[PDB]
Amino acid sequence: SPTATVAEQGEDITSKKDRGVLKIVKRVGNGEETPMIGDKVYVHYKGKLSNGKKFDSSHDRNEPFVFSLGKGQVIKAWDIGVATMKKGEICHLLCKPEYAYGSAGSLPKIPSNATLFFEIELLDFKGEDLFEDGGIIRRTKRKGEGYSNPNEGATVEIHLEGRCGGRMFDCRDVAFTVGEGEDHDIPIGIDKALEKMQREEQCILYLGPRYGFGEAGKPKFGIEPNAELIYEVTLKSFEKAKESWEMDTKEKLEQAAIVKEKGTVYFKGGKYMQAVIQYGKIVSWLEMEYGLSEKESKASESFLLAAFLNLAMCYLKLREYTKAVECCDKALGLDSANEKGLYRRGEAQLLMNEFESAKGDFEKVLEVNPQNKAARLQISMCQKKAKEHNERDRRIYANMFKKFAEQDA
Amino acid sequence: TIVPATLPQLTPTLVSLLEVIEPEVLYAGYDSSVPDSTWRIMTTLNMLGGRQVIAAVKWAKAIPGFRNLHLDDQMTLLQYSWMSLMAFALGWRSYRQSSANLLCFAPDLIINEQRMTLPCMYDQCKHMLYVSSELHRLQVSYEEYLCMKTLLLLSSVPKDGLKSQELFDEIRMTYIKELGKAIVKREGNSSQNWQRFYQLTKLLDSMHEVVENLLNYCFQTFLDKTMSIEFPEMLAEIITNQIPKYSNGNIKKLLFHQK
Amino acid sequence: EEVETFAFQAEIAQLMSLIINTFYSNKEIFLRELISNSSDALDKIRYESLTDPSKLDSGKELHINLIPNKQDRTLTIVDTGIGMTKADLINNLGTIAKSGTKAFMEALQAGADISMIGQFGVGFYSAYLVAEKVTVITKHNDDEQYAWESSAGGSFTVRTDTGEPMGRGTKVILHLKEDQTEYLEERRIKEIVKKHSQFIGYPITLFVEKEKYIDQEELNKTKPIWTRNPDDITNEEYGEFYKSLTNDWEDHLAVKHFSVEGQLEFRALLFVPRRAPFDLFENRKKKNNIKLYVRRVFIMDNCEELIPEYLNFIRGVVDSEDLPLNISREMLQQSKILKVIRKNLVKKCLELFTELAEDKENYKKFYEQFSKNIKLGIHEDSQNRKKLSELLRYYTSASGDEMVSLKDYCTRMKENQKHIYYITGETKDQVANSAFVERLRKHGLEVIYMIEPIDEYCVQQLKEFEGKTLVSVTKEGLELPEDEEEKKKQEEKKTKFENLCKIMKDILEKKVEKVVVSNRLVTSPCCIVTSTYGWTANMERIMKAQALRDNSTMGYMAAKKHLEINPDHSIIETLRQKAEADKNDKSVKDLVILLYETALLSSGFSLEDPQTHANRIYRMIKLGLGIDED
Amino acid sequence: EEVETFAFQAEIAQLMSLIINTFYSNKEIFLRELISNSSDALDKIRYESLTDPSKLDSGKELHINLIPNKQDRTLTIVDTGIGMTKADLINNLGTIAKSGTKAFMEALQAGADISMIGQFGVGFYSAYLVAEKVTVITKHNDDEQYAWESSAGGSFTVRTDTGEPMGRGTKVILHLKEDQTEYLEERRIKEIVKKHSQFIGYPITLFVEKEKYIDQEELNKTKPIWTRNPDDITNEEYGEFYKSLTNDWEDHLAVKHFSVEGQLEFRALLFVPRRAPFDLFENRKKKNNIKLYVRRVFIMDNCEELIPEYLNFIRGVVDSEDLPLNISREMLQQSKILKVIRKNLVKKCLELFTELAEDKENYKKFYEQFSKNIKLGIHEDSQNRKKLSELLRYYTSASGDEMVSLKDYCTRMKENQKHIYYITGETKDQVANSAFVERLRKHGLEVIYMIEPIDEYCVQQLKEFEGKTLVSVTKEGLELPEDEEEKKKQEEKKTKFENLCKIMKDILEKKVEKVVVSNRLVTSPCCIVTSTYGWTANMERIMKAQALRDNSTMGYMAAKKHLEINPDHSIIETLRQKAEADKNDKSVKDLVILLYETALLSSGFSLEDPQTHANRIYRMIKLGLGIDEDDPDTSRMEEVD
Ligand SMILES: Nc1ncnc2c1ncn2[C@@H]1O[C@H](COP(=O)(O)OP(=O)(O)OP(=O)(O)O)[C@@H](O)[C@H]1O
Ligand SMILES: Nc1ncnc2c1ncn2[C@@H]1O[C@H](COP(=O)(O)OP(=O)(O)OP(=O)(O)O)[C@@H](O)[C@H]1O
Ligand SMILES: C[C@@H]1C[C@H]2[C@@H]3CCC4=CC(=O)C=C[C@]4(C)[C@@]3(F)[C@@H](O)C[C@]2(C)[C@@]1(O)C(=O)CO
Ligand SMILES: [Mg+2]
Ligand SMILES: [Mg+2]
């Protein structure tokens, strides 16, 4: 059995000389010859146990095995593996028991030392992942602590190269807080990228069209690739954000007042993303049980309702009536007569071409405030738009049955 | 005139659906050059715990019947039984990986008897190994095991009940029925199936003690500050919110079987 | 003619063989019989002690001990009953078909309450079903201890007992057959005792060895509470009894404790579960659930003859006295008796449900689990439809989410109604919003929404309720209490629309029996309606979905279809005008098809093309979307 | 010590009572026993006459006569068998457990072929189930005639018979109970006799007075044939027998005649009818139409233990001469015997079906009537599933119009075709033209068309044929052996329309689990498929329609709908571009819904509320025809807080 023969054969790939990995690789194909590091790399493979036994597993279905982390994660044999893997390489790397199923093993089914090698056809391994929402390309040099990351509310110390997309901007080591994504012109998506970064993590961060200032066209950067703001960022230190379950009842009310003012400013400044962020913190705190008396609970409701309504407007400008609708619904669940929410939701509906719901909301605005002519105007507009749509249909569909009868020659 | 047709029975799939839903085991461990100090062991376990606990949430969401519960209740059940489920998962993995009453947590994490160095384990070995020893003694299979695991998800309620109670009760009977079937088709017995069912139920009922005692220890580890232990925010939030529910008696235990 | 007279004789050797080899179907019963005789022995002494307490001077505890002995491969059964004198060991154990018990009973005063297990004189001998040798040790108060022994070879012996004193009572020792050792196991014993003898009045203790010491385990802990006057039993007691009886954990939902004192005498407890029963553990599929006991001894548990299947969710016990039984005591003689019992069981089940229903919340809990069975009882068991139907509950248009009784529908009827209107369909919502009920809603008439597949089977039998006729609103010929002026208008409409009726029939020739002008629709231009005699769309879809089929089933049950036209509809007026202007306008042809086809779906029929429907729509979409022909 | 030894005794009075009152439940069997005694009497003389022919000098006809007498409430049974001498008369009728028959056989040499019915010694007394008194007159060749007479009073008498000579044999007269005259009626007799005798080796004549004269009818004209060597029986003979037994004007379709030797002796005949019974699965009476006889005497019927229900259409008889019976001879004593019988009967039925299948014409006739039973067997019988599957026949997309074998399928399959594909649905037309098979047909792959609702059960359990698994073409993940170039082209298509997948999903968030780009379609703009697990279309509607079911299970088992889009349809391409231009375009929203509703109908799902689909259509008609007649403070909104 050739797969058993190779159990003790191969070139030396080591960490440990008496264990390690046997390079029994049959060939290198079609792809870059450089060993590569990267995420979401899918490979196909078939194989056998080091003792020559056919393995009863997913390789017989050509499983598209994925390498989830840049330097590997779930198969010690293949992660030790990635370090020497090339695109197009057809690997046969037999890794001794320390790389098999671990100290526990996968027993009851598989003993810890029942190792394998497979004929693995490799996909390009260069490059780590981007982002769940897209907008950023992340590449790493050094892992951080692994037990600690910034969370919004914490100031962080970030080393910045000064570089950005082959160009320079006011990129400097910064004792960054989240509001700075807009206040200090620091690419805005950094606000969330930092929460995944671990202390002392070294990562190259590309901030794309909506993650960076591409769409904004900020002249402050003045970088032709304003939409590709890529440079090294190192998270060197940070403080700990106090969590909403760590913060006290009064502490959360106090911060809601502080944050509310920041949010108001951001809103007015056109910094709707930051306004949303500040209002986001306000709402998540306020939604929690505080143990307040009935009159004290109104400080919470006041901050909460205001945040919903401010968010609704931020979203009316940032998003096409999506979260804005939800915010209004929340504002109205809290206060069914708040004409601001009734009105703003009604606009969100009209602006999505939902004429019936828009009219209903504006009618409600006027029950609360019969003099709020804004709703009266919106109702008239809803009616007019509905008329326009009805006319378009007549232009297309009128007398189609005849058209069809004649086409049918 | 008309005779209603009889009904052939469709392949029951709840057990195989659960087999599909169950997640793969996660890795945990630490740099072996570091001794297994009280705080290192706890840290390794805490990080694994938070990751396994979140996997348990999507796992629960994926379960037929469960998924139709009001979301608040779905999350309530996960908190109240998070310990039950984790302990059960551990106990089974242990005894199947080895007949020894060890704790098998991850591909790289085993706590053998000589490694039960945490004060918490020394005091709770009688509870954490209650479960692995008993499942071993009864030679519990994977499938009847899964049926029981699901019932543990459904083993506790608020003292004030759930909103979708008239579903919850259905879901429990549904999985009770599946457990019965899981036993009958494998044992080949009659009166002994009745008894095996009760013998297994008794684990799940006695596990209420297993959990309160283990629970109080996890509360103590998180609450005090005597050990250099990192904890994930997830578990820390759960415990912060769970401690007063426990101490106020707001969590009700369910009794699965008598007779 | 001198005539010789002879007595009858018997051959003992063969008689013994029949006793052992051709009366019994099983071996469980060897224990059952030994225990029964033992309990009678105890009861006899208990009785004697009533007038002479000194009878118990030799010992007062009346109990039965089962003592298996694996090492010796034996089983010993011990009691403290009367015991036997030397004379009785010889007469009663040495005589086939002698019955000491019977003689005892015969010798009793008329007022005696000794509900003795009666007997034939054969049963002891069943011991040899499992034993190679049987030894009986006994002490009677009036005699010495003696040891009786036999291998049933046509003799037996009597020895003076020189061993340990008993005080009083009988000890039976079986020396078991080499290959039947399961009777030495705890599990087998417990199953047998529980199954046949759990209601014997004297405590039974099983003595076994474990780490060593002997574990004394009582088995018959439950009392046969049905023997008590019903008024003295609390709900907790019924509940506990029930749980032990059925190995449940839930309590009963309802119970009826009933007795009969006529030609036959018996008592029974019938329980209604709080949850529909299910096969938690393997059993005979659809075994019925009423057990029959005679004199507190289990006799039979799956007698189909006792109760209709629709009432098989009732759990319960019937305990009779003095029924003629088969020699094996496994079966009842004269099955005409079962017929009588069934009559009474059903009669009382109905009273229970009638009463249960007074509690609206509980009725709901009931009905949610058990409505299917009620409905089967309508379909079947025709003599009871008149009462069962009152237990039905339905959603109606005026009920919102409440279900109401048919009597509620009735009380709310208008003076012009002669009929109860109902509609059937797949879901609530599809029925409630249907075109078929638009004019009924207009005039404020109540409609019943029938939903379950079962409802279609059932509706066929329920022709009349309290004198009102039940009618469907999906059949042609629906009668509404309309005025003369509208009727005249309808005729005028027929006159102008008949041209379409004919044209549409020429179109679409094979799809309908006819096309008519209708007075039932408001907003729909049309619908598909069923014939007066025939089957509805719902019936067809049900029949076409069943596992059990024939060709004749639908060759016979297929529905006829008729197309109804809303005269008052704007599409319809357009067609009248267009079609009259040109009978061959091909666009009319296509419009006729879409109205029909759409009507088919909206009326509950499967669309068989089905692709053609989709294709017509795709063409319309291309236009709507601005996609040209090429 | 001194040990006394005693014999066992019996109390005759009680013994007599028990035999009469507790051993039997069916009074009618008294006739069965009187006849059995009689046939033994005849057979015994026949045996003796084999070596000594003078034994029959006293009379040569061996027969049984039944002579009811209305007028005197009596029944007489007459035979010409050995008869009894005075000594035998007293010893055998006066001893409760004596069996002369048993002794007789014991007195014979090994090799005698004769098999008697009796052996217990008590059957005679069953006469008293219906008789008040009985009289027995008998003549033995070696003695005079004697008349035995008694009530079951503990004693009996013997008289010299001073009446007419009977030549030879025994005459039994019952004086019937005043209330038991139903057994005196010609109809009832004949029915009992038919039921319990049927295959008695000697003829029975029933003598009935009519306007008078006596009508002498021979009962049991039909002889058992299973006792004969099968090689010796013509097909017509089997058919004649069959028709007689079943009152079937039609002949049998197939028959299997076999025997089993060793431990339990068997002979059996199994017949396959040419028509399925109309109530085959509906009758509420027991389904196994197999009768069990012992020594040619009927014992039992309607026993579930003998045959699995799926084979409840086989008509037949099982006969043995060695099984233990209870005292009434109404059942076997050891139920484990039935287990063995069943194993063998089933094995042979399957052999018969296999043989039948070789005749293509006959198999078709069979299958047309009984394919339901085969399919049920697949569902219920886990052991013979592996053979039963060979008997299935289905229409396929490449069979034209005849049904073919699963083997036929797999012998036409293509080198890269690793899987067997099938579709299920209401009718052949619907499946044949379904969107789901458009690519498969285009590539030349064969699809099995399953139609019956029961087909849905077989597809669960069959799983694979000769290692080739089954694939439903209505589920997600359908795999075709596509080329690399084809895959690359699809990869590019799949990075397009992503926005549509998302937009449509938002529109349909509450309707579908997913919206994806697909490849099973080549003509049609879209379709609905079900995910890997759960009920599929058809399976779900079937379950909903079951008359009796637990509806709560439908909250667990239900389809998970995925919407597949055909990227190379013009509707789809237009929407792609249009939707990208405006995410809220009202017309996009409206058209997406119609495609969805349409796809459900064409995909085999019911539609949730038809009075919407219809309304969408009605307004389109009105536009199409031009029928438009009925279808023609503010600053607070800006405030920031
Ligand atoms: N344990 C005992 N103690 C005292 N007397 C006994 C005992 N067992 C049997 N006998 C006596 O022996 C007699 C023999 O009756 P046997 O018990 O054989 O009938 P049976 O088993 O009651 O009959 P059946 O099976 O019809 O119920 C009884 O009538 C009784 O007087
Ligand atoms: N018509 C008859 N002619 C000759 N002998 C008879 C006749 N009827 C009865 N006998 C004799 O009486 C004996 C007793 O018969 P009986 O029917 O009681 O016993 P059995 O047939 O063994 O009972 P079972 O049918 O239960 O086995 C027979 O063995 C036989 O010798
Ligand atoms: C006594 C408690 C109970 C423990 C846990 C019991 C259940 C469990 C099962 C597993 O498969 C993995 C981790 C956990 C979830 C656990 F092992 C660890 O997290 C550490 C733990 C909380 C504890 O040991 C601590 O005191 C640490 O705070
Ligand atoms: Mg007795
Ligand atoms: Mg006889």
Instruction: Return the CATH number at C581.
Output: 1.20.120.790
In a domain, D159, yes or no: yes
The response to whether residue D80 sits with its C-beta less than 6 Å from ligand 2 reads no
The response to whether residue B221 sits with its C-beta less than 6 Å from ligand 3 reads yes
**Residue where a domain stops, chosen among C195, C218, C241:** C218
The three-state secondary structure class of C353 is: helix
Strands D131-139 and D169-176: antiparallel
B33-253: CATH number? 1.10.565.10
Q: Cβ of B11 and D549 within 8 Å?
A: no
The response to whether residue D170 sits with its C-beta less than 6 Å from ligand 2 reads yes
> In sequence order, what E strands does D143-194 have?
145-150, 155-160, 169-176
Q: C37: annotated binding-site residue?
A: yes
In a domain, C523, yes or no: yes
The response to whether residue B211 sits with its C-beta less than 6 Å from ligand 3 reads no
Q: Cβ of A399 and D626 within 8 Å?
A: yes
**Residue where a domain stops, chosen among C182, C199, C218:** C218
Task: Tell how far CA D280 is from the center of its chain.
Answer: 7
For residue C231, give the CATH number of its domain.
3.30.230.80
For residue D624, which residues of chain A lie inside 8 Å, CB to CB? 397-401
- Rounded distance, CA A288 to CA A281, Å? 12
Calculate how close chain B gets to C454, using CA atoms only, in Å: 9
∠ Cα B159 B161 B164 (to 5°): 165
Same domain assignment for residues D515 and D607 = yes
For residue C99, the ligand closest to its alpha carbon is: 1
Please say whether the beta carbons of B95 and B136 come within 8 A. Answer: yes
- Rounded distance, CA D503 to CA D499, Å? 6
Q: Which of A400, A405, A408 sits opposite C623 (nearest CB)?
A: A400
Peptide bond into C610 cis (omega under 30): yes
Same domain assignment for residues C22 and C139 = yes
DSSP assignment, residue C332? B
Q: How far is CA C5 from CA D94, D148, D157, in A?
A: 11, 10, 5
Residues annotated within the binding site of D for ATP are 37, 79, 98, 124, 329
Task: Tell how far CA D390 is from the center of its chain.
Answer: 20
Structure tokens at C561: 């279809």
H or E element at residue A379: helix A373-397
Best residue for ligand 3 mutational test, from B30, B37, B44, B45 (most atoms within 8 Å of Cβ)? B45
Burial of A3 (0-12, 13-18, 19+ CB in 10 A): buried
**CATH pick for A249-396 out of 1.10.1740.10, 3.40.50.720, 1.25.40.10, 3.90.1570.30:** 1.25.40.10
The amino acid occupying position D197 is: S
Please say whether the beta carbons of D514 and D563 come within 8 A. Answer: yes
- Going from the Cα of C137 to the center of ligand 1, the distance in angstroms, rounded, reads 14
Same domain assignment for residues C56 and C113 = yes
- Residues contacting residue A362 through CB under 8 Å, at least 6 positions apart: A342, A343, A346, A375, A376, A378, A379, A382
For residue D92, give the CATH number of its domain.
3.30.565.10
Please say whether the beta carbons of D150 and D134 come within 8 A. Answer: yes
Burial of D61 (0-12, 13-18, 19+ CB in 10 A): exposed
- Rounded distance, CA D80 to CA D60, Å? 8
The response to whether residue B111 sits with its C-beta less than 6 Å from ligand 3 reads no
Burial of C623 (0-12, 13-18, 19+ CB in 10 A): middle
Burial of D64 (0-12, 13-18, 19+ CB in 10 A): buried
Q: How far is CA D47 from CA A21, D63, D113, in A?
A: 92, 15, 9
Tell whether domain A2-121 is in CATH 3.10.50.40.
Answer: yes
Q: Which of C243, C247, C547 sits opposite B5 (nearest CB)?
A: C547
In a domain, D376, yes or no: no
Structure tokens at D490: 């699809």
Please say whether the beta carbons of D288 and D306 come within 8 A. Answer: yes
- Going from the Cα of B121 to the center of ligand 3, the distance in angstroms, rounded, reads 9
- Could you tell me which residues of chain D have a Cβ less than 8 Å from any Cβ in chain A? 583-586, 589, 620, 623-626, 628, 632-634, 636-637, 639-641
Using the structure block, give the residue that is written with the tokens 């005080």: C167
The response to whether residue D37 sits with its C-beta less than 6 Å from ligand 2 reads yes
- Residues contacting residue A119 through CB under 8 Å, at least 6 positions apart: A26, A45, A46, A47, A90, A91, A92
Q: Cβ of B27 and A104 within 8 Å?
A: no
Q: Cβ of A102 and B43 within 8 Å?
A: no
- Residues contacting residue A343 through CB under 8 Å, at least 6 positions apart: A361, A362, A365, A372, A374, A375, A378, D636, D637
Same domain assignment for residues C52 and C170 = yes
H or E element at residue D135: strand D131-139
- Determine contact: C326 vs chain D, CB below 8 A: yes
Same domain assignment for residues C83 and C173 = yes
Closest listed residue to residue B131, CA positions, set B195, B53, B52, B211: B211
∠ Cα D393 D398 D401 (to 5°): 60
Task: Tell how far CA D32 is from the center of its chain.
Answer: 29
HSE-up of residue A121 (Cα within 13 Å, Cβ side): 8
For residue C119, the ligand closest to its alpha carbon is: 1
- Rounded distance, CA D445 to CA D65, Å? 73
Give the chain D residue nearest B67 (alpha carbons).
D556
DSSP assignment, residue B255? P
- Could you tell me which residues of chain C have a Cβ less than 8 Å from any Cβ in chain B? 187, 191, 243-244, 247-249, 275, 278, 280-282, 376, 379, 454, 457, 460, 546-548
Q: Which atom of ligand 2 is nearest to the CA of D79?
A: 1
Please say whether the beta carbons of A125 and A37 come within 8 A. Answer: yes
Same domain assignment for residues C352 and C410 = no
∠ Cα D110 D115 D118 (to 5°): 120
Same domain assignment for residues C441 and C504 = no
Q: Cβ of A398 and D623 within 8 Å?
A: yes
* Sheet with C561-565, edge to edge strand ranges: C515-517, C561-565, C526-530
Same domain assignment for residues D184 and D238 = no
- Rounded distance, CA D177 to CA D169, Å? 26
For residue D90, which residues of chain C lie inside 8 Å, CB to CB? 6
Same domain assignment for residues C97 and C182 = yes
- Rounded distance, CA A272 to CA C49, Å? 100
Please say whether the beta carbons of A215 and A227 come within 8 A. Answer: yes
The response to whether residue D604 sits with its C-beta less than 6 Å from ligand 2 reads no
Q: Cβ of B5 and C376 within 8 Å?
A: no
∠ Cα D529 D532 D535 (to 5°): 75
Q: Cβ of A397 and D624 within 8 Å?
A: yes
**C 432-451 residues with CB below 8 A of D?**
433-435
- Rounded distance, CA D607 to CA D600, Å? 7
The amino acid occupying position D328 is: S
**Residue where a domain stops, chosen among C412, C439, C472:** C472
| Catalytic positions of A, written as ranges | 45, 55-56, 75, 101, 118
Calculate how close chain D gets to A406, using CA atoms only, in Å: 14
First to last CA, chain C: 122
Chain C: partners with 3+ C-beta pairs within 8 Å: A, B, D
Paired with A48 in beta bridges are: A54, A117
Same domain assignment for residues D206 and D247 = no
- Rounded distance, CA D602 to CA D582, Å? 29
**Full domain range(s) for residue D62:** 12-219
Using the structure block, give the residue that is written with the tokens 């004693």: D155
Q: What method was applied to determine this entry?
A: cryo-EM
Q: How far is CA D413 from CA B207, D395, D409, D436, D591, in A?
A: 56, 16, 7, 20, 41
CATH topology for A136-238?
Chitinase A; domain 3 (3.10.50)
Closest listed residue to residue C520, CA positions, set C561, C486, C496, C495: C486
- Rounded distance, CA A333 to CA D256, Å? 79
For residue D534, which residues of chain B lie inside 8 Å, CB to CB? 13
Please say whether the beta carbons of D420 and D411 come within 8 A. Answer: no
In a domain, C369, yes or no: no
| Cβ-defined contacts of D626-631 (< 8 Å, 24+) | D626/A394, D626/A398, D626/A399, D627/C570, D627/C571, D627/C574, D628/A394, D629/C570, D630/C570
- Rounded distance, CA D442 to CA D519, Å? 12
Q: Which of A393, A397, A401 sits opposite C590 (nearest CB)?
A: A401
Q: Which atom of ligand 3 is nearest to the CA of B104?
A: 11
In a domain, D478, yes or no: no
Structure tokens at C609: 């093309």
Q: What are phi and psi of D51, to 5 degrees?
A: -110, -20
The response to whether residue B129 sits with its C-beta less than 6 Å from ligand 3 reads no
The alpha-helical segments, DSSP class H, found in A287-352 are 297-318, 323-334, 339-350
Q: Cβ of A353 and D584 within 8 Å?
A: yes
- Determine contact: C549 vs chain D, CB below 8 A: yes
DSSP assignment, residue C380? S
- Going from the Cα of D125 to the center of ligand 2, the distance in angstroms, rounded, reads 10
Structure tokens at D502: 């998302």
- Rounded distance, CA D527 to CA D514, Å? 12
- Rounded distance, CA C47 to CA C114, Å? 8
∠ Cα A124 A128 A133 (to 5°): 120
- Residues contacting residue D106 through CB under 8 Å, at least 6 positions apart: none
- Give nearest CA residue, ligand 1 atom 22: C119
- Rounded distance, CA D555 to CA C4, Å? 85
Using the structure block, give the residue that is written with the tokens 């010609």: D186
Maximum C-alpha span of chain C: 123
Task: Tell how far CA A294 is from the center of its chain.
Answer: 38
- Rounded distance, CA A215 to CA A227, Å? 7
- Going from the Cα of B229 to the center of ligand 3, the distance in angstroms, rounded, reads 13
- Residues contacting residue C81 through CB under 8 Å, at least 6 positions apart: C38, C39, C40, C41, C42, C43, C44, C45, C62, C168, C169, C170
- Going from the Cα of D34 to the center of ligand 2, the distance in angstroms, rounded, reads 8
Cβ neighbours of A120 (radius 10 Å): 22
Q: What are phi and psi of C137, to 5 degrees?
A: -110, 130
Give the chain C residue nearest B198 (alpha carbons).
C247
Residues spanned by CATH 3.10.50.40 within chain A? Answer: 2-121, 136-238
Please say whether the beta carbons of C500 and C515 come within 8 A. Answer: yes
Q: For chain C, what is the domain count?
A: 4
In a domain, D7, yes or no: no
In a domain, D594, yes or no: yes
- Going from the Cα of C305 to the center of ligand 4, the distance in angstroms, rounded, reads 30
The three-state secondary structure class of D276 is: coil
Q: How far is CA D351 from CA B16, D258, D387, D597, in A?
A: 35, 11, 10, 51
Cβ neighbours of D466 (radius 10 Å): 9
Burial per residue of D474-495, b for 16 or more beta-carbon CB atoms within 10 angstroms, e otherwise:
bbbebebeeeeeeeeeeeeebe
The response to whether residue B87 sits with its C-beta less than 6 Å from ligand 3 reads yes
